Structures are given as structure tokens and as C-alpha cells.
Amino acid sequence: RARADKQHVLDMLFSAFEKHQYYNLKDLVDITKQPVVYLKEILKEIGVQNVKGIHKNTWELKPEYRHYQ
């Protein structure tokens, strides 16, 4: 199924996160035209969220239990 995309999609996040510690959903879709709901479900399990002054949506790969790096 699309788990191939999941595993393969995480690789894209590391490349993205390799350039900057933060990325909003809008920046992630440019790097991957895959449905946000699909990316969000991946970011929801290992990602994080942070609203700021103007409510800047930023996601971060939670390294707390990432056995894969």
C-alpha cells in the first residue's frame, strides 16, 4: 500500500528537517504533493505542532523515541 510512501516520505522529512528544525504544513506539501491528511497522520505519530504569535503552524519530528535515524 502507501506504507512505501510513509517510509519513503519520512526520508523526505529528514532532508527537509536537515535544512531547518521547523517546517509548516505548507512547506511540507511543496516538498511532497501527497495529501496533507496523509502527511499529517505521519507527523501526528512522530511529528509535533506549535502555534505562535500569528499562529505560525510548525511541525518537528519528535526525537523522543525515534529508533530510526
- For the chain, which domains are there? 1-69 (1.10.10.10)
Q: Please tell me whether 20 is known to bind a ligand.
A: no
CB 58 within 8 A of CB 46: no
Which value, in Å, is the radius of gyration of the alpha carbons in the chain? 12
Place of cell 519520512: 10
Method: NMR
DSSP structure class, residue 7: H
Give the dihedral of Cα atoms 61, 22, 42, 33; nearest 10 deg: -150
Q: Please tell me whether 47 is known to bind a ligand.
A: no
